[PDB]
Amino acid sequence: SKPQPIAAANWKDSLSELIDLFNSTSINHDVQCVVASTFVHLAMTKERLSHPKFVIAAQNAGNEDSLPSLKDFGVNWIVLGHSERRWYYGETNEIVADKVAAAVASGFMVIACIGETLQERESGRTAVVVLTQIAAIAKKLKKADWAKVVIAYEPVWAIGTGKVATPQQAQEAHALIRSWVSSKIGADVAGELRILYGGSVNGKNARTLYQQRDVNGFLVGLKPEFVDIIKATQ
Amino acid sequence: SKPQPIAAANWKSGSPDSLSELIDLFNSTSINHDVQCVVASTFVHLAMTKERLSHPKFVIAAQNAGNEDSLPSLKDFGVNWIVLGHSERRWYYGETNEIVADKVAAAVASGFMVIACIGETLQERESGRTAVVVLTQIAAIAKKLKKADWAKVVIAYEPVWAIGTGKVATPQQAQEAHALIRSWVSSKIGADVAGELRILYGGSVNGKNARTLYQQRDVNGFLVGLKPEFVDIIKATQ
């Protein structure tokens, strides 16, 4: 028995044209849809996006006055710790953790990203890297805060490397996240946890991915195929 | 009246669930209607399944055995069911229509009830070859059987075209596939044999869709993967 699925798209196609696509798409099942945008595009997304089942997220904001501004403006979701924040911008476990706690303290729903690299994965350090990204996050949170939290797992080892993830590998990475939250936080919190897959997902694979026990939806890039990704969430 | 329904669960190696924990779930599930429940296991797990599974409405099956001495060993052991010709045997292990047909005959000869799997791929489906592919897979099997033999045979239609492709089968398509199997048995074997035949759906089935699938005129149960949801799959057989 699975919690409500999430379908979140990340903007790194024309924004407008995509927003019209979604505005005219019929989604008949229980799924929260998220469109995360950059600060330059926020105002045009909230202006234009009018789909009832869609909400708008901010990205990586980490300053309390800005967080407060966003909420005033009508943005309640935020995505943090995506792969490029950690490996290009140098956001560490602790910096992501603080960003999450501050987001949580101001009434945001949070999509926190975590994931390992090919180097990390090839030395057999998936579990220690992945469980340390979260322990850090968990260390800042109260048990009730978990209500406001979603996890995206990003198989960084698999983006731009020529390595391919199978649903089996997605499933296995998802289960360890679950186990840990379940032993350290609780089976109640664990049971209600939406763990999103932030790897390579298209129309040929979304179903298979979604059908795994521990996968609860997707964090992916903003493209026209997102619409098949949503559909796969049944 | 439809014939007795069958709810068959297939164990695939490398699942996120534990065999034992699943057997316990089932052992403690109340099933109040007439339904034969099958748990199909691999050879390593067989012995644990006979020793542990004790629910009255459940039996155990073996998978893909094809050697006469082996089938006799299984029957002595207390196994009377077997599942053959599942999708992967046809695509990965090289089991053709004929090899599957021989496996069925030998299973039948030694007193087994037999769940023989059939179905087409997306490629076969998209070129409009469903019927010839599906009817050739069964014709192969039929050519080895006697009319009486059908008493021991159950067919599972596997929409291979719908597993791993992004394609989704509606209950309407499952009905249409199932009726062709029925028509053909009827015309070629007998209306008597046809009407008593269980034709299982071996596609993607969960709790939100088992009902809708089970109510289709030609659907007589399910051959699915061993998961906790199997319980709801059983319940969908009323």
On chain A, the residues whose CB falls within 8 A of the CB of B164 are 208
Q: Find the closest chain B residue to A29 by CA distance.
A: B208
Cα–Cα dist B112/A5, whole Å: 44
Of A178, A208, A226, the closest CA to residue A8 belongs to A226
Closest CA to A227 of A213, A212, A206: A206
What DSSP state is assigned to residue B5? P
Domain ranges of chain B: 1-238
Alpha carbons A163 and B2: distance in angstroms, whole number:
50
C-alpha distances (whole Å) from B153 to each of B146, B181, B234 are: 11, 13, 20
Please, what CATH class does the domain formed by B1-238 belong to? Answer: alpha beta
Is the distance from CB of A74 to CB of A113 less than 8 angstroms?
Answer: no
Taking the Cβ of residue B166 and every Cβ of chain A, the question of whether any pair is shorter than 8 Å is answered with yes
Residues of A in contact with B204 (CB under 8 A): 211
Question: A1-234 domain in CATH 3.20.20.70?
Answer: yes
Say whether residue B168 is in contact with chain A using an 8 A CB cutoff.
yes
Specify the amino acid at residue A205: N
Round to whole Å and give the CA distance between B161 and B141.
21
**Integer-rounded Cα radius of gyration of chain B:** 17
- Interhelix angle A93-105/A126-138, rounded to 10 degrees, is 40
Q: Does B94 touch chain A (CB under 8 A)?
A: no
Active-site residue, A91 included: no
Write down the residue that tokens 């946890």 correspond to: A193
Determine contact, residues A81/A133, Cβ cutoff 8 Å.
yes
- For this PDB entry, the determination method is X-ray
**C-alpha torsion A137→A141→A146→A152, nearest 10:** -10
Instruction: Indicate which of B18, B21, B165 best probes the interface with A, i.e. most A CBs within 10 Å of its own CB.
Output: B165
- Binding site residues of B for substrate, as ranges? 10, 12
Cα–Cα dist A23/A54, whole Å? 9
- Report the candidate in B31, A223, B236, B174 with the shortest Cα–Cα distance to residue B182: B174
User: Contact B166/A213, CB-based, under 8 Å?
Assistant: no
Q: Which residue in B177, B179, B219 sits closest to B198, CA to CA? A: B219
Give the 3-state secondary structure of residue B236.
coil
B103 within 8 A of B62, measured Cβ to Cβ? no
Q: Which of B22, B161, B168 should one mutate to test binding to chain A, selecting the residue with the greatest count of A CBs within 10 A? A: B168
Other C-beta atoms closer than 10 Å to the C-beta of B232 total 16
Task: Decide if A120 is catalytic.
Answer: no
In sequence order, the 6+-apart residues with CB closer than 8 A to the CB of A128 are none
> Which residues fall within 8 angstroms of residue B76, CB to CB, at 6 or more apart?
none
Using the Cβ of B170 and the Cβ atoms of chain A, whether some distance falls under 8 Å is answered with no
CA atoms in the 13 A half-sphere facing the CB of B17 = 18
**C-alpha dist (Å) from residue A90 to A10, A60, A85, A86, A96:** 20, 12, 6, 5, 10
Q: Does B204 touch chain A (CB under 8 A)?
A: yes
Write down the residue that tokens 């296991």 correspond to: B41
Structure-block tokens of residue A210: 């979604």
Query: Which residues of chain B make contact with A234, given a CB cutoff of 8 A?
Result: 208
Catalytic residue from among B45, B120, B158, B178: B158
Task: Determine the residue of chain B that is closest to A211 in CA distance.
Answer: B204
CB A218 within 8 A of CB A195: no
